[PDB]
Structure formats: structure tokens, C-alpha cells
Amino acid sequence: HHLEVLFQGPSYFIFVLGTAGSGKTTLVKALQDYLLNNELDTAIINLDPAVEVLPYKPDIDAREYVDVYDVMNKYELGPNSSLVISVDLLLTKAKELKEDLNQLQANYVLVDTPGQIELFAYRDTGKILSSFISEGSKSVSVFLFDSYLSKDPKSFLSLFLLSSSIKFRIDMPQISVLSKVDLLSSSELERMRSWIEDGSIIDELGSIDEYSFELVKTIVENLESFPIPVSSTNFSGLDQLYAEVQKVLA
Amino acid sequence: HHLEVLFQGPSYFIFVLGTAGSGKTTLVKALQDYLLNNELDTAIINLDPAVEVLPYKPDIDAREYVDVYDVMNKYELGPNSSLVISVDLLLTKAKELKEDLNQLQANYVLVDTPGQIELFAYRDTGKILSSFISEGSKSVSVFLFDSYLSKDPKSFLSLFLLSSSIKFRIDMPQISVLSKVDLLSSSELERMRSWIEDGSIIDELGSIDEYSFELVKTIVENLESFPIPVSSTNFSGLDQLYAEVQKVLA
């Protein structure tokens, strides 16, 4: 017999990114339900070492590799630097991690990430880790535009800047999602869609210095499409999201 | 007698902002030492409800107003959303806070902030809170460019984007500081200074899509000055920083 030989198939990694509280962990659970309901084998990787309660069962869990509170004590750091270094420490255990990855056998692998967006936008950590965990496989990032933050036009545009910094750093395609869309009224959603798909957002800014205006002009001039509206609680928009994942990975 | 009548003088609020671990809390302590060594009356406000150990004695402390861990339990949130909501909860106690502010009597008030930069760049929380705590007084924000992150040109430019989003949202002038400069060699510092003061950074980018290039061009075209090099551990650059604070507040 040969016990090194395992059944092989395609694996697709889906990294769910977003600001604090934008709904990443809930969406991972909802997207896993959706994919399994459609007979698509799906596993979950939790990369947040600080989370306490999860609505899903992670197949790989960062909390078994690094103790955040032990880090904050052993290095005398602040609450946020401690979470950054903890994620950084994951890469020191690349040996143990690659073994867990090897023994993982799933067609779709959902990666829940911490709601510290500087790890993906302002540091190399997000790129190095995401490339390490998805090595040898196609990947896509899903970035969550929090609906609560997006209904304000100036706040919406800052999130497009943030998402662009992530896309530039991470080495994979990115899908934009408008998360928690149930928090919006019909008129708010339509107004936001017109802001983007028609460029009218530039008028909702009013008093803006010349510098910020030039950034905004560049953003709006390169807005390809409106973020996919998703509501994990209402379990809506997951088919659009999964249709775009398939279009991107193909 | 009239016991409502207190001695009045000018107060200047200095908000120290920056990415996780950029050195905010250490710089606050160093800047307080510097100002007191020069016979300048200085108090400290700690706005980070999650910090465990501080090198200074805060005159107002957010931890006495909100319990972060109690928030994460009572609302079933993640580790980062819990810290955002905790800061948000501070404004619910505006009554108690304004009383502490009133009873504060200091010429310079240093405000240590949490290393969750979305509170200042991607949410209104930072603006509302900073305006509330400094009401009736001149204020300045000090944003920390972490030297470790700034030595990579693409990482430096993303931090200029981030600092611009903060400056646009916060309603006060902002001073840029290159923190932890002791981590850099002489050649690295000079190279970074040439990147900015001469615009040569645009060549250190190499393979860049057209969209990211247009953002970078706008950033570099509006780089007024190089961030002030500060090293709290070497206690250097604090006089330059304090000379610029005075120039801005005047």
C-alpha cells in the first residue's frame, strides 16, 4: 500500500475581510450553510486568534496556535499591537500550519479574518499569511462594506480607498460586498447605487478641500461595479455572491 | 464666596493617533516628560478602554467608564467590534465625562487613543469624541507613521492615504510624525526623506496598475513636508514636535 496518496481535487480559498463588526464571522457561517445546502464541500479556517465564540466549527483554528492574552503579557504591548503580533506569530509555526492545510480536504475553504484591517491594508501580514494558507490553490478576497458606514457618502468613499489599499497589497482578486444590507431602506440602497453606478456621489460631498477632491475623482472614475448587497441575517444575496465567486475563480 | 469661579487659562489638546503599536502610549509619556521638564503644565487623557498597563498616570481614564470585556459578553460581538462599541459607549456618558473635563485644569492635554485606526479614518466616532473632549479649546492631532512600516515605499504611501482619510474626517489640524525612528539606519532615513522631499518614491514602486498609480501621483503631488522623526526611547525629536505643535496652535 501507499499511504501518502490521497484523493485529489480542486480547492478554492475565499478570504472574508472587512472592518470591525462588518459581519465577517456571520457571513462565513451563512456562506458555509449556502454552499453545503447546494452539496458543495466546504471547510472553514479561523484566522482570528482573539475571538471567543464562533457560530461555526472551524476546521483550522488560529486560537490553538497563539494565545493572544499570553502575548500581551509576555511582550507588554497594547491591546491592538498584541493582536497584530499574535497574527504575525502564526507564521512562526508555518511547519505545524502546513500540516493542517495538507490534511484539509475541501472544495471551498472559507477564511474568517480578524477585524483589524491594518493587517491587510497597511502591513504585509495579510498578504504573506493569505498566500501561505492558499498555496497551490486559486483564491479570492471578499471585502465587506458595512452598510451602516456606507450610507454616509463620505464614509462610503473612504471605504473604497481602504478596499483599494487591500486589493493592491493582497495578491488575489477581490469581490466587494455591501454587508448587513437589511439595515438599509429601499431609498437608501437605491441612492447609494446611483451614487456609484452614475457618479452622483461627487455632489453629496459639499465642502471638500482640493486634495480630498482629487482622490475622490480618481476613486469614482475607477468604480467598476456596485458592491453586491448581502444580508446574512435575511440570508439574501448569497447566490449573487456565489455567482461572482465562480466567475472570478474561472 | 463664589465657589463656581475657578482660575482660567488656555488649554491645548494634542491627540496622538496611529496604527497598532506605532508607539502612541510611549510617546504620550515621553511628551509629558518633555513638557513638564520645561515647566509646562500637562495632563493626560486615556481614551483606550482596553489597555492593561500604562507608563503614565491618566488624569481621565476611559477604563473607569466602560468595561470592554463586559461589552463583548453583553453584546456577543467579536474582539474588534467590541473595542469599537466600547469607545462608542463613552459618548453615552457625556454627562459624567464633561464633569471630569471641567474639573481638569491643564495647559497641555495629551490624549492617548486606541490603536484601532478605523475609529478615526472610517467611522465618525473619532471626530465626535475628539470634538467633545476638546470643546472650547484649540486642538491638534499627531499621527504616527510607524518607522518599521514606512521603510517600505509602498507601505509608506498607504499610510499617507490613511493619514489623509483621518485628516479629512477629524476637524483639527494634523502633524505627521515618523515614530520609532531609532529602528532606521542613516541611509534608510535619508532615502525616505528623498522619496518625499524629492518625489523619487514614484520610481520605487515598479509593477503598479494604473489605478493605484493615479492615487500615488495625487498623494506625492500633495506631500507638503516629511514627517517629523521622533524616537521616544532615544528621547529625540520631541523639541521639533513641540515646535510644530506651537506653530500649528498659533
Ligand SMILES: Nc1nc2c(ncn2[C@@H]2O[C@H](COP(=O)(O)OP(=O)(O)NP(=O)(O)O)[C@@H](O)[C@H]2O)c(=O)[nH]1
Ligand atoms: N524602538 C522603539 N520602540 C518603541 C518606541 N516607542 C515605543 N516602542 C515600543 O513599541 C511597542 C509599542 O509601544 P506602545 O507605546 O504601546 O504603542 P501603542 O501605539 O500605544 N500600541 P497600541 O496600538 O496597542 O495601543 C512597545 O514595545 C514599545 O516599547 C520607540 O520610539 N522606539
Ligand SMILES: Nc1nc2c(ncn2[C@@H]2O[C@H](COP(=O)(O)OP(=O)(O)NP(=O)(O)O)[C@@H](O)[C@H]2O)c(=O)[nH]1
Ligand atoms: N442586521 C445585521 N446584523 C448582522 C449581520 N451580520 C452580522 N450582524 C451582526 O453584526 C454584529 C457583528 O457580526 P460579526 O459576524 O461578529 O462580525 P465580525 O466582522 O466578525 N466582527 P469582528 O470584526 O469583531 O470579528 C453581530 O451583532 C452580528 O449579529 C447582517 O447581515 N445584518
Ligand SMILES: [Cl-]
Ligand atoms: Cl507587521
Ligand SMILES: [Cl-]
Ligand atoms: Cl461607528
Ligand SMILES: [Mg+2]
Ligand atoms: Mg469576527
Ligand SMILES: [Mg+2]
Ligand atoms: Mg497604546
